Design a protein around this ligand. Structure first.
Ligand code: HEM
Ligand SMILES: [Cl-]
Length: 385
């Protein structure tokens, strides 16, 4: 029998502020396909992973190519074959082995940021560390002036806040303009005087990227690759603050910190859904969606679906295997997944090395702002002696 009765929920009502497990369970139990505020949400593992793996049918470009004549969103908003070329070009720069060479530098800068905090006996971990750490390391990785961090964070925040909004303010437009001008100058310089950095090297070789391609990639990294890590830092420190024995076991334990970070990305993925638009009719859960349907693939829900011991609502350090789709799946799987793991494991290890014992401030209940453009904690007040 076919499915003619589409479930509908109001997104803003999902019980998501306090516990993402309750929120995703509410959505998952509404059905395999759930219509919320213009989009068809695919909630079940079999459909989500098949859809992520089928770019011909579930297009990223149709969901993510901006209107007007913007910079190309390389590679997020491309489908094969163009996407395949982009990922082939970028893969070597983002591999675990390539990024491992940056580790002494990233570690040095992480230690410095922790140094400035540890003597206070308190911090608000989002404003004081999580919101700053990703851009600091980005400047280090890509060879940008360290003194530009304040301006760049301001620009990033303004651009993220204004995206997909009908009436941008004059301050928003100016911030977008200043960021674009700043990045344009940087890429042009790297094309004329290439160094042994990524943004220089991608513009040289047998198949190089154009200036406009590197400009679009640079914008995408800033808008997509930084706040995601910020969010994950907050959840990492929250769980450590309220689990003393886990904290103690993880200190000076890179093997177990790796596992912990996988659990944080599994359970609180910073981008819990991926948008696509269908290119032809498809049947999911017995229900046929016409061509051109806007869908959202629910990776965070799938990560919690209970189908095995690695997909529960609990933080699970045990078990031989840890696996998940918090970095997505299929060909668009997070280009920066290896960098995110490096940065998060580095932050946890170095935090524990200088601040092994800490706790949540009194009467603090962790929540996200929901609905909003962020799945990050609103704030995270920490205390230590
Ligand atoms: C915990 C941190 C992160 C999470 C949870 C995350 C999550 C994701 C997800 C789910 C996707 C797939 C989106 C889709 O299929 O439409 C994605 C793509 C991407 N991410 Fe991340 N990300 C993180 C960190 C980073 C970092 C650190 C970088 C680089 C600095 C980065 C750069 C990218 C890029 C360029 C893509 C597009 C890849 C493509 O379309 O082929 N991300 N990310
Ligand atoms: Cl406080």
């Amino acid at each position: 029998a076919g499915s003619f009765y589409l479930p509908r929920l109001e997104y803003s009502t999902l019980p998501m502020a306090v516990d993402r497990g309750v929120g995703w369970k509410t959505l998952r139990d509404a059905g395999p396909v759930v219509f919320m505020n213009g989009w068809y949400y695919l909630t079940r593992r079999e459909d989500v992973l098949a859809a992520l793996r089928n770019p011909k049918v579930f297009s990223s470009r149709k969901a993510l190519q901006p209107p007007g004549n913007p910079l190309p969103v390389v590679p997020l908003a491309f489908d094969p074959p163009e996407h395949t070329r982009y990922r082939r070009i970028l893969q070597p720069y983002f591999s675990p082995a390539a990024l491992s060479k940056a580790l002494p530098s990233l570690r040095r800068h992480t230690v410095a940021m922790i140094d400035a905090i540890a003597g206070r006996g308190e911090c608000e971990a989002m404003a004081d560390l999580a919101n700053l750490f990703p851009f600091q390391l980005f400047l280090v990785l890509y060879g940008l002036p360290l003194e530009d961090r304040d301006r760049l964070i301001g620009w990033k925040d303004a651009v993220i806040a204004m995206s997909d909004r009908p009436h941008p303010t004059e301050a928003d437009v100016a911030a977008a303009r200043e960021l674009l001008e700043y990045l344009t100058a940087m890429v042009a310089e790297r094309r004329r005087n290439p160094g042994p950095d990524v943004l220089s090297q991608v513009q040289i070789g047998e198949d190089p990227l154009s200036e406009i391609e590197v400009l679009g990639l640079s914008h995408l990294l800033i808008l997509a690759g930084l706040d995601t890590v910020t969010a994950a830092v907050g959840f990492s420190l929250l769980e450590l603050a309220r689990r003393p024995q886990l904290r103690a076991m993880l200190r000076d334990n890179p093997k177990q910190i790796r596992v912990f970070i996988e659990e944080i990305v599994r359970l609180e993925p910073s981008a819990p859904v991926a948008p696509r638009v269908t290119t032809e009719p498809v049947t999911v859960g017995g229900m046929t969606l016409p061509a051109g349907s806007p869908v959202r693939l629910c990776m965070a829900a799938v990560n919690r679906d209970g189908s095995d011991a690695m997909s529960t609502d609990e933080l699970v350090m045990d078990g031989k295997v840890h696996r998940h789709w918090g970095f997505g799946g299929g060909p668009h799987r997070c280009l920066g997944s290896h960098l995110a793991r490096l940065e998060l494991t580095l932050l946890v290890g170095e935090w524990l090395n200088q601040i092994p014992d800490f706790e949540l401030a009194p009467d603090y209940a962790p929540e996200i702002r929901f609905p909003s453009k962020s799945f990050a904690l609103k704030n995270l007040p920490l205390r230590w002696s």
